[PDB]
Design a protein around this ligand. Sequence first.
Ligand code: R4C
Ligand code: CA
Ligand code: CA
Ligand code: CA
Ligand code: ZN
Ligand code: ZN
Length: 152
Amino acid sequence: KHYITYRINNYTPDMNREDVDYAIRKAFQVWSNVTPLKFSKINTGMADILVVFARGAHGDDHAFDGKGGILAHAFGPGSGIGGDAHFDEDEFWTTHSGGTNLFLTAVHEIGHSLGLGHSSDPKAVMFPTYKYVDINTFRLSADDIRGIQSLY
Ligand SMILES: C[C@H](NC(=O)[C@H](C)NC(=O)[C@H](Cc1cc(-c2ccccc2)no1)CP(=O)(O)c1ccc(Br)cc1)C(N)=O
Ligand SMILES: [Ca+2]
Ligand SMILES: [Ca+2]
Ligand SMILES: [Ca+2]
Ligand SMILES: [Zn+2]
Ligand SMILES: [Zn+2]
């Protein structure tokens, strides 16, 4: 199906609540812009993709590892934790270059939420390693486009 819902379960205290909403909205928009996917934000109740901030062990057999290392993870589409995107609260989430940029990380993780694996293109958002790029000139690489359009 092309209609997919999300809910921001909780908000990192690192950031303004409004900035988390915006970063997440823009991350979904990135993928919506290159597919027929329609995303809808839910405030309360059942949603396909939950956006969660948590530290250490947090219920899903994939515990986080403290500051650094693994920044976030996400599960491919399914029931329950399927589709959910988890961000390690031990990171320092930001709208800027400092710490770990939430928008960029969210684009990567939503990619996983939708069923993508990793890319071999070093410029792809789905390359395995986080790298800050200038947010205002950010673009999905042609390989990201191939990946997502193959699924939707
Ligand atoms: C501290 C920071 N760490 C990272 O970038 C690390 C390597 N990457 C991760 O934390 C992966 C998550 C990530 C990648 C990106 C990104 C952003 C922009 C461009 C390219 C990539 N954003 O988040 C972890 P994952 O979701 O792939 C994951 C895979 C397997 C398991 Br099991 C669990 C999770 C760094 N190396 O700068
Ligand atoms: Ca889910
Ligand atoms: Ca970590
Ligand atoms: Ca934090
Ligand atoms: Zn998790
Ligand atoms: Zn990844």
